[model samples]
Target: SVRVLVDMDGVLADFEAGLLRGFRRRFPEEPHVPLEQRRGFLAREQYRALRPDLADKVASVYEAPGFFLDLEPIPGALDAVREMNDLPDTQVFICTSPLLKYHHCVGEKYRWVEQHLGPQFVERIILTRDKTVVLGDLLIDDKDTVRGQEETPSWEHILFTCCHNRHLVLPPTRRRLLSWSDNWREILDSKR
Candidate 1:
């Protein structure tokens, strides 16, 4: 059987929108800013720049009950995950990188997954700051890591793009999944 590691933020959930809304509701001073004007990962730095008073306030919300739970799925995350789940010799594990200082962020995300994907949709939930340590047969993450190094990353790295990665260049070894609606059966079928 092949093990798959997936990221929660961009891969499964519409995290950008949820975060945007969360920030807007929490700090109405800045209002909603466009992705271009915003800077840093998910506009973390920009949010800080806008309101110094909300630095921790913005970061703290990531640990809220419905912060990430309020997120929607990427365009085709449901279809892709469902198709892969049906295939034999393939297992999908949610290996996410939510905030770690507090457990609420990850807990809320897990609750969302349980509610949406059901309890058994994921075989395991590996929460870590870096995914290179634990290798899997396939890893779908927005961030790129040193492959074939830690844990012998033989896993196929699929980089799903979004506003955060719009300016980031993909490493040569990683394959880019332009939109969530992309068809990846051919890619997964080649796993053998």
Candidate 2:
């Protein structure tokens, strides 16, 4: 069976809305909210500056009502995962970086996946911060882990686009699912 490993945030689900909502709720004081460019995710300190109280509040808010799992599915996401599930002899896996403290929230993430994509669609769910050990025939992530290492042996990697990770300009050997609008047809038609 072909193994496909997928990322949760920015791929299967969006944490942006939840984080934004938490920001608004936690810091009603911050007046001017600037648009999130590519670096904001890492520079969350700037966001916290708006509300000093929200410094450590970042991790907790990940479990907020609409932070991770509660987020709306990406466009065409259901159809894509469904198509993957429908494919014979294939296994779908999900790997995410939800805070270690929120490990129990794995169930919630699964619930969100079921609601958005479909019930029992994902075969494996892996919640971990370090995904270097993730082994699969095809791996899809929104990070720089696979940059310039496309032909790194035994796998195909797709850098799914994300707001923070969009700055990367992948070399030609790699395949990128540029936006949530991307569909399974592209995966099916892929040469590598």
Candidate 3:
């Protein structure tokens, strides 16, 4: 059987969109960096580059209660996962990295999966700080790289497009999937 792992924050749910909206609503007066200009895997990193003073404020926005649960789904993400699972001989899991202060981050992520992907998918949730150890065939995530204590991940890390990775580059050997609606199946099939 083939197994696939998808990241909850960037690939499944719209983390950047949610954070941008939350940040603007909470601190309208502060300097803001729109998604277009945001770079790196995390929002705070972009803020650190553009506005050092506002860097810490990012934690306040995302870590706020209901942030994860209230996020909008990345367009077509749900359908793509369902299709992968529906395919014969395939199993998919929601592999995610949680915040250090996981009081709300952890439960909310499960709730988010249950709420968005439905109860059937809740069991597939794998909340961890390190994704490299998780066993799977392919890991679709928005991060530029996936690494942990494990020397090498069992699955191939397919780079999913996000505002944070807009400026990032990769080698041809390292495959990139820009959107769920475009060429995902073709790319994934070739990888396996």
C-alpha TM-score for every candidate: 0.83, 0.75, 0.95
Per-residue lDDT of model 1, residues 11-50, tens digit only: 8887777777787787677545565564446456766677
Top-scoring candidate (lDDT): 3
| TM-score: the better of candidates 1 and 3 | 3
TM-score, prediction 2: 0.75
Worst ten in a row by lDDT for model 2: 146-155
At residue 101, what lDDT does model 2 achieve?
A: 56
Compose the digit string of candidate 2's lDDT tens values, residues 57-147: 6555665554666677766665676677678777777777766557546678878877766666544678766565667677777665643
Residue ranges of candidate 3 with Cα displaced over 4 Å: none
lDDT of each: 0.71, 0.65, 0.86
Clashes of 1: 0
What number of clashing residue pairs does each candidate have, in the order they appear? 0, 0, 0
- lDDT order of candidates, top first: 3, 1, 2
User: Where does model 1 exceed 4 Å of error?
Assistant: 36-42, 49-54, 144-152, 171-173
**Candidate 2, superposed: residue stretches over 4 Å from native:** 31-35, 40-54, 63-66, 146-154, 188-192
Model 3 lDDT tens row, 1-192: 778898888888998999989989988998888889877777787787777888889888888899878999989999989898898778899998889878778989888888888999999999888998899888999888788888877898888989888777888787788889777777567755
